[PDB]
Each structure stands twice: as C-alpha cells, then as structure tokens.
Amino acid sequence: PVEVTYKNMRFLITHNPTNATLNKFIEELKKYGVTTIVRVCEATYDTTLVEKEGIHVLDWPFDDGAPPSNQIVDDWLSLVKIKFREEPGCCIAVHCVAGLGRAPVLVALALIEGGMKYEDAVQFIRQKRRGAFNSKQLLYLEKYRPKMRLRF
Amino acid sequence: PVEVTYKNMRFLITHNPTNATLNKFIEELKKYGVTTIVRVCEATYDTTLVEKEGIHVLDWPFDDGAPPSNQIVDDWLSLVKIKFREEPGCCIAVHCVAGLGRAPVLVALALIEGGMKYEDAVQFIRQKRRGAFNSKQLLYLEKYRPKMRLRF
Amino acid sequence: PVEVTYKNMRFLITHNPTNATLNKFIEELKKYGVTTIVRVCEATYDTTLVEKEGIHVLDWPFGAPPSNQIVDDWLSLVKIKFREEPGCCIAVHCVAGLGRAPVLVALALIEGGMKYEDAVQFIRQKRRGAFNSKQLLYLEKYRPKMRLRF
C-alpha cells in the first residue's frame, strides 16, 4: 500500500482484497482514515461489510490501457473536492485488481489538478512505488488536458 | 519517531524517553542533527546529560487539549526562524509524554506558517504518522489564525 | 539507496557496486527506471554490461567543489533526461557510502527553486547524515544559474 499526500489530499493506493481478508483490509483502511474506496477495475468482493464500517465503495471501472472517460474524471475531481473539504485529514483509497495496475492513474490526475505537470505527478508517485505506471499510461497522461478548476 | 521537513525546516516528533534509555535517545537525536528539544507535556527526565551533549531542552507545557497560548506560538515561531537559519540543516525535536499526544501540534503550526492551510499540514503529518491528530485538535487547528510573518 | 524527487526530477543516490554484484545492481536500477548513472568518484567497475542494458554511465569525478564544467554538464543532463524520458531516474554514487554523491542532487534541487538549506533538509529527511561541514559551507556560497524551466 502506497500513500501519497499533496495539499489537503491524501490517497491510499492499495491492492484488491478478498472476501476472506476483508476484515484486516477494513481494519487497515480505518487506521489510514479512509472514508471512500474507488474500484477502477473488476469488482471482486462484497462491499456490505465495508459499507457497514462507514466506508463507501464506488465502482468506476475504466478499460485497461484506455484513458478514463471525461465523466469519470469529473466525478473523481468532484469527490476529491468534497471529501477532503468535508472530512479534513481523511483519505481516499483506490485499487485495481492484480497489483497497482491502473489504480495510480486517478491519483496522478488529482495531483495534476493540484498544480503538477504529469511528469511531476508520475515522479511523485514513483518515489513511493517504483514500478507505478506503464508505457501506455504515460503516453495518455502526456495528452491529458486538466480542467485546473480545483481551488486550494 | 516521525520526521517532517518542509522549507529550511526539519522536525523530529519523538516519544518521551526515560532516564534509563537517555543515552540511546541522545545518540539518535545527534544522528538526526537535533540541536533543540521542546517538551510540551510533563517533564519526566533530567536534562543535564542532554544539555551536556549540546542539546538544549525547552519546557513549554500547554494544557490538556487546550490550544497553545499565543506566547508559546510566538516563542515557537521565533525558535523555528533562528535555529534553521543559524544552524542550516539542523533539526528541532518535539515530544509529549505517552505517544505522539500534542507534540505534532506545534509542528503543524510551523507548516501553516510555511504556507500550508491547516488541512494540508494535517495530511502532511499523517502521511508520516497515520494517527497523528485527534478531533479536539483538528477543531482548534481549524480556528488557528497564523501570523504568516516567517520569510523563506 | 535513497530516492529524492522534486519537480519532474527523480534521483537515486546509490552505493558503488562491484563487478560481481553488477547484475543485481542493474536489475534494481532498471526497476527504478534509471537511464543514466553519474559516477562522481573513483571508477571501480566495468560498464559494458550496464551500457548494454540501456544505462549510460558518465564519469565526472571531482573536499574540492565540482568544477563549473561538471555543474554545467550535470544541469544539462538533468534538463534533457527528465524531458526526453518522462518519469525516468538519474542515479549517482561515489565509492564508499553516500560520500559526495548528494552534492549534485542538492544542486539540481536548488535549480528547481530551493535555497540550499531547503535542499539539504530535503535530502537529510531521506539520509540523516547526508552532508558534512565543508560541503554545507560551499553549498552556502553556490550561485545557481536558475535557468531550468518547469
């Protein structure tokens, strides 16, 4: 689990848990203060127990190698804006299905919104997770046009 | 021991040592380059050995939960200003009595002074120590009015 | 190995390897995405294997502050590499421990906008014993070109 913080934002890029290791998963998330989990890949576990513990789970899958749709980006930035404002010091977790995968992508988008160029966001994440992004992802982050509407 | 660095500032939030483990405590502080220790809670150990090693100890206790008095904040900001300037690359350690406690509060104040909003300071610290601040502390950091007089 | 990242820059301050542990060395560098190695002290190992793996090795040996030419070459490398290879890493090492390896990294950070004290703290946060007195003194007198754009 890699943790990245920038302005009033703090993210936890985690691994996909299993219905079996769900209790320990929830236990850790709670300690990190995560209030929301965004699943950007296959949904592999039941979220009733997670939701019961006060952790809302959002399923926003986006085709691998494929860039997240504009709507996902807008929904993500909207989530970042409200959560870190209404719940000061909280954390948003994001995960894919087998290893970091494309989970780091949305985090990078949040950092770019925070004022970083995509290269900076990539380095900032890699400093925490050496193998963070793959070639295809770097190429589309290079073409990403930020809205730059978040205020800090 | 959590370490936080921002502009020309570097802080070490440590645990309260004992007269018995004082030697190892001093040994570590020296390696971190700390030149000053600020005790914000109960004074539990003799400081002669610490002072002899070139580490000045300051006792600035501030009430149960209660926000630090304006004078403590001014004294703290004055210490931050001169130490990191007169001793480039040094470190200021801060500790309470049983765990982190109120020790991260002053560090947050220094970060805010450095340009961060309190939420950013809280996240910046939490990235290093997950359970950093409690509800009461977050509430008064929210009401804290920085002087914003330190120059960088 | 300490890793420092600031703007579009990411550096790996490593230890001097041996011809014997060269394979594992290369394996790690590749995982960190390093494309270049700058050796600022004695050259102790053969670089054919390293160069073959796509990692260019530069010998810029320089106590004595790095010469203006070394600084210019270093800043030129920082400018082009992080631009032409987004997200890459530049490794730097001396001969026996951190040594003088951190100096050039500090210079890159100052170029990035940090005052030398900030650069020193930024590095020490990663490596407690980073710089020695002599080095702090000359970093204090260092006059940055401040020409790098971000």
Topology overview:
Three copies of one chain form a homotrimer.
Chain A: E1 2-5, E2 10-13, H1 22-31, E3 34-39, H2 48-52, E4 56-59, H3 70-86, E5 91-95, H4 103-113, H5 118-126, H6 135-143
Parallel strand pairs in A: 2-5, 3-4, 3-5
Antiparallel strand pairs in A: 1-2
Pfam families (chains A, B): Tc-R-P (PF22785)
Domain Tyrosine-protein phosphatase (chains A, B): 1-152
Keywords (chains A, B): Cell cycle, Cell membrane, Cytoplasm, Cytoskeleton, Developmental protein, Disulfide bond, Endoplasmic reticulum, Endosome, Hydrolase, Lipoprotein, Membrane, Methylation, Nucleus, Prenylation, Protein phosphatase
Describe the structure.
3 copies of one chain form a homotrimer. The first copy, chain A, is α/β, with parallel strands linked by helices and 152 residues long. The first copy, chain A, has a single domain (1-152), classed as Protein tyrosine phosphatase superfamily (Protein-Tyrosine Phosphatase, Chain A), CATH 3.90.190. Helices cover 40% and strands 15% of the residues of chain A. The first copy, chain A, is built from 6 helices and 5 strands. Chain A has helices at 22-31, 48-52, 70-86, 103-113, 118-126, 135-143; strands at residues 2-5, 10-13, 34-39, 56-59, 91-95. In chain A, strands 1-2-5-3-4 form a 5-stranded mixed beta sheet, sandwiched between helices. The relative contact order of chain A is 0.20. The A-C interface holds A 117-120, 122-124, 126-127, 130-133, 138, 142 and C 3-10, 31-33, 82, 86-87, 89, 150.
Per CATH, what is the topology of chain A?
Protein-Tyrosine Phosphatase, Chain A
Query: Assembly state here?
Result: homotrimer
Give the percentage of residues in beta strands of chain A.
Answer: 15-25%
- The overall number of domains of chain A is 1
CATH homologous superfamily identity of chain A: Protein tyrosine phosphatase superfamily
Distance between the termini of chain A: 26 Å
The SSE order of chain A reads EEHEHEHEHHH
Helix run count of chain A:
6
Helix coverage percent of chain A: 40-55%
Morphology of chain A: globular
Question: Biggest β-sheet of chain A, characterized?
Answer: 5 strands, mixed
The CATH class assignment of chain A is Alpha Beta
Overall SS class of chain A: alpha/beta
What Rg of chain A do the Cα atoms give?
A: 14 Å
Biggest chain pair contact, residues each?
A: A-B, 17 and 15 residues
Total number of beta strands of chain A: 5
The strands making up the biggest β-sheet of chain A line up spatially as 1-2-5-3-4
CATH architecture of chain A: Alpha-Beta Complex
PDB class: hydrolase
Keywords: prl-1 ptp4a1, hydrolase
Assembly: trimeric
Entry title: native structure prl-1 (ptp4a1)
